[PDB]
Amino acid sequence: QVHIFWGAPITTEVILHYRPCESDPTQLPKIAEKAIQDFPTRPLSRFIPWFPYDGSKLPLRPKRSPPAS
Amino acid sequence: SQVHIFWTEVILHYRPCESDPTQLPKIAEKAIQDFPTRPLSRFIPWFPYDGSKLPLRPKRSPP
Amino acid sequence: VADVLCEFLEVAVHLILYVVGIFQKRKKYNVPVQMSCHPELNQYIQDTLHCVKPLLEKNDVEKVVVVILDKEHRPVEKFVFEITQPVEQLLRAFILKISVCDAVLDHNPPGCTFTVLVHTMQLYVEE
Amino acid sequence: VADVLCEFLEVAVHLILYVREVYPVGIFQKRKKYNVPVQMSCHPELNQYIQDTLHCVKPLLEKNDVEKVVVVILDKEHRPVEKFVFEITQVEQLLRAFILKISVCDAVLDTFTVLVHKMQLYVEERA
Amino acid sequence: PTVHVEVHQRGSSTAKKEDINLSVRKLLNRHNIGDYTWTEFDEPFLTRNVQSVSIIDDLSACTVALHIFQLNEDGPSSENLEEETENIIAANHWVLPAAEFHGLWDSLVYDVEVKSHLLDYVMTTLLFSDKNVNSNLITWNRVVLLHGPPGTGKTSLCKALAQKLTIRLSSRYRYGQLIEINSHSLFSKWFSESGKLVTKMFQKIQDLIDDKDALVFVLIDQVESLTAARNACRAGTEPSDAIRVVNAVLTQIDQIKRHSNVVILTTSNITEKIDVAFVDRADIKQYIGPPSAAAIFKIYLSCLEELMKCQIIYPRQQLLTLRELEMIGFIENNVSKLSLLLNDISRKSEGLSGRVLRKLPFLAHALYVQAPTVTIEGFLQALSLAVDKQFEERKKLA
Numbered sequence: 142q143v144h145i146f147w148g149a150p151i152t153t154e155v156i157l158h159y160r161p162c163e164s165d166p167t168q169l170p171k172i173a174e175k176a177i178q179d180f181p182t183r184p185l186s187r188f189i190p191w192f193p194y195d196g197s198k199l200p201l202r203p204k205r206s207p208p209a210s
Numbered sequence: 211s212q213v214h215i216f217w218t219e220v221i222l223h224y225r226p227c228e229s230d231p232t233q234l235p236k237i238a239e240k241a242i243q244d245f246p247t248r249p250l251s252r253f254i255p256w257f258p259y260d261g262s263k264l265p266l267r268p269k270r271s272p273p
Numbered sequence: 274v275a276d277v278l279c280e281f282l283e284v285a286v287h288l289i290l291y292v293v294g295i296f297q298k299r300k301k302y303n304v305p306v307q308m309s310c311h312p313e314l315n316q317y318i319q320d321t322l323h324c325v326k327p328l329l330e331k332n333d334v335e336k337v338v339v340v341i342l343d344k345e346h347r348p349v350e351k352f353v354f355e356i357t358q359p360v361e362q363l364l365r366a367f368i369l370k371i372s373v374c375d376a377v378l379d380h381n382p383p384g385c386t387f388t389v390l391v392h393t394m395q396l397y398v399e400e
Numbered sequence: 401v402a403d404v405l406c407e408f409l410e411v412a413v414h415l416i417l418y419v420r421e422v423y424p425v426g427i428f429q430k431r432k433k434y435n436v437p438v439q440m441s442c443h444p445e446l447n448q449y450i451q452d453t454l455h456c457v458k459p460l461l462e463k464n465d466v467e468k469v470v471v472v473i474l475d476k477e478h479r480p481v482e483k484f485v486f487e488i489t490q491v492e493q494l495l496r497a498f499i500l501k502i503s504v505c506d507a508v509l510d511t512f513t514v515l516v517h518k519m520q521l522y523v524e525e526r527a
Numbered sequence: 528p529t530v531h532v533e534v535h536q537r538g539s540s541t542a543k544k545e546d547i548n549l550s551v552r553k554l555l556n557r558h559n560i561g562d563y564t565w566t567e568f569d570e571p572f573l574t575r576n577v578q579s580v581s582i583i584d585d586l587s588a589c590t591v592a593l594h595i596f597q598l599n600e601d602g603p604s605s606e607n608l609e610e611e612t613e614n615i616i617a618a619n620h621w622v623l624p625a626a627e628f629h630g631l632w633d634s635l636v637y638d639v640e641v642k643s644h645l646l647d648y649v650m651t652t653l654l655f656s657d658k659n660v661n662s663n664l665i666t667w668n669r670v671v672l673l674h675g676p677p678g679t680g681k682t683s684l685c686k687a688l689a690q691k692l693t694i695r696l697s698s699r700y701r702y703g704q705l706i707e708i709n710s711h712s713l714f715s716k717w718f719s720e721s722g723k724l725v726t727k728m729f730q731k732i733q734d735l736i737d738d739k740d741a742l743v744f745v746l747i748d749q750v751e752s753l754t755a756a757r758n759a760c761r762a763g764t765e766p767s768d769a770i771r772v773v774n775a776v777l778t779q780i781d782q783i784k785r786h787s788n789v790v791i792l793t794t795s796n797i798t799e800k801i802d803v804a805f806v807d808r809a810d811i812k813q814y815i816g817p818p819s820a821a822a823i824f825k826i827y828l829s830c831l832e833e834l835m836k837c838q839i840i841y842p843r844q845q846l847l848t849l850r851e852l853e854m855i856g857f858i859e860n861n862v863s864k865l866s867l868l869l870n871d872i873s874r875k876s877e878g879l880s881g882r883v884l885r886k887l888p889f890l891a892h893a894l895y896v897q898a899p900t901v902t903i904e905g906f907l908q909a910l911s912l913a914v915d916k917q918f919e920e921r922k923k924l925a
């Protein structure tokens with residue numbers, strides 16, 4: 142069962158929720174059948190540093206200290 | 211308080227297999243409303259039974 | 274009792290689809306009624322009432338509005354069934370009320386294409 | 401407990417909306433209202449909007465027909481460009497984690513409709 | 528033979544298509560009587576679910592085909608750049624059939640039968656498409672040119688075409704798209720950036736074409752601006768606009784030639800100063816000329832019975848068409864005089880552009896008659912003076 146709340150103002154059956162006070166969407170169901178269908182699913186890409194902490198490449202540093210409080 | 215449209219916070223129903231009606235939701239609104247009823251007419255047979263008159267009976271019986 | 278009331282709503286919705294040759298006499302609830310043999314429609318109306326079933330498990334309900342549509346899906350007729358939901362003659366008495374209603378009144382084109390509604394034993398018709 | 405997991409989903413939906421910059425109106429600001437370190441919306445219209453969307457899925461979620469809470473972020477064509485899919489298989493540890501999750505999940509990534517087909521949030525995004 | 532019938536379904540009407548078809552066929556077979564249009568009906572369903580029925584070129588024949596259409600309410604969508612979203616492309620996007628386009632195909636009046644030629648062109652295109660002819664062996668560039676005098680409704684005919692085709696060919700393509708191309712907002716000229724800009728809007732055209740269940744019409748205004756004559760122009764001072772923006776469109780249009788659900792419609796003003804390698808890549812280059820006497824009379828009629836329809840000219844006198852005047856043989860009579868005087872205005876108002884023709888009632892009811900309700904032959908006199916007012920005004924601006 143699939144529950145397509147068109148809203149947020151700017152086999153398997155479908156329990157869509159209409160809840161109207163406007164009567165002027167003119168498209169819940171196709172957009173409901175749009176929100177229902179799976180589309181080109183990008184694989185979960187993985188994270189990695191590209192600049193690691195090199196022991197042979199070391200940083201800079203300025204002298205002064207911040208005003209403590 | 212709730213109305214359902216087996217086609218007020220409305221719980222419509224879709225049944226995706228039937229989905230020929232390109233514009234569904236506006237169809238769904240029409241089914242809900244009331245509209246002027248005609249009176250349930252208290253009915254009366256027009257030709258009533260007068261006890262002063264007697265009807266007709268043929269003699270014969272089925273076998 | 275809600276379950277058997279839903280089966281009587283089955284009896285209603287579909288026999289009122291009748292109240293042409295694609296329909297047939299068969300024993301329902303110990304009366305012969307002339308409905309349709311359609312198994313798809315049988316299980317589809319069963320599904321309508323059994324989704325109405327949890328609705329009545331809520332017990333908050335007003336009407337079971339079995340809208341007999343026209344072919345336009347824009348009601349020229351209708352059949353609101355305002356049962357104020359909290360022996361065979363009375364289980365047939367409801368059917369005789371609806372038959373006398375369609376008697377003084379009239380039906381719609383053969384395929385009534387009706388869409389059952391609910392608003393969550395007595396009735397009338399908004400013609 | 402679902403009476404506060406719905407508000408956890410509230411947290412989720414607005415934080416997605418917030419990090420995605422789906423609107424330039426910067427209404428969002430830190431809100432520990434009733435000691436919840438989460439960043440909801442300051443539109444009571446929309447807080448009660450999530451409240452009653454979850455209210456009308458409350459006869460609908462814990463019935464366990466749920467196979468995935470797909471918070472779609474819609475598009476200009478109202479298209480599911482980013483289906484934030486949450487599997488319904490259920491103590492702040494998850495919450496921040498989910499929060500964490502969402503953030504680290506937006507890590508790779510760059511108008512919402514709450515469709516309802518380890519809270520393994522995964523994003524089906526356009527390639 | 529065959530006759531075509533089109534029926535306006537209301538947007539707030541939602542009955543199924545086949546019920547509408549059956550009801551209109553029922554009305555036709557009951558009536559079964561020329562090219563007049565029905566407006567009066569006798570069925571509550573058909574009233575609340577129909578607006579009008581019309582016959583497009585008195586016979587009880589039953590060679591009837593029904594086209595049912597829905598003129599889309601909202602107007603144009605806008606097309607802007609992908610990353611330069613400010614103003615780079617700004618193309619107009621009509622989702623046909625569209626509201627602002629109806630009645631347009633009827634109003635236009637010509638005398639060279641452009642409508643039939645330019646409609647049965649697309650009909651034969653579809654015939655050759657469905658029969659699977661060797662596209663390597665018999666081909667068409669899917670480009671139609673219309674050129675002629677300014678203000679003579681050259682571009683009006685293209686929107687009418689698109690509307691009539693998305694109406695006629697319904698149930699063969701769910702809908703049509705019409706992309707109006709602004710040939711003046713694609714000249715960001717510093718070293719061939721416009722010649723690179725044509726590419727993006729044509730990729731968007733490709734996007735709207737691959738939706739193979741939608742008939743798309745690409746309407747290019749001022750096709751002389753995009754394709755400037757490069758050869759005869761002895762101006763080497765044109766660095767890369769006359770050579771790398773015409774060559775940047777002569778390819779993208781030879782690329783959509785392979786597809787079949789696209790038609791290119793172009794409107795030109797100057798016959799010369801256009802690339803000779805684009806007056807070969809157009810199937811029909813039809814000339815739209817200034818209205819002629821009979822055409823002027825018919826347009827003036829259209830205006831006058833329009834005014835009578837809205838009760839402006841309150842005393843309704845039968846305006847006799849030119850065919851009835853020919854039949855009587857120009858005989859002066861107490862009702863036939865008004866048509867004669869109209870016809871004298873027609874010769875006197877000869878040579879004007881259709882746009883000023885469709886203006887002239889406005890002025891003739893503006894200055895010469897202030898009456899909220901006008902009797903005929905004074906309004907006609909107002910026209911006969913306002914036309915000379917237009918001649919003298921044109922002479923005033925030298």
Ligand SMILES: Nc1ncnc2c1ncn2[C@@H]1O[C@H](COP(=O)(O)OP(=O)(O)OP(O)(O)=S)[C@@H](O)[C@H]1O
Nearest residue numbers: 634635636677678679680681682683818881882885
């Ligand atoms: N020949 C005609 N017959 C009837 N109406 C005409 C005719 N020509 C023009 N019109 C009216 O003219 C109005 C607009 O015409 P346009 O098509 O814009 O002229 P046009 O040919 O576009 O000129 P350009 O090329 O864009 S300057 C429309 O409302 C038409 O009804």
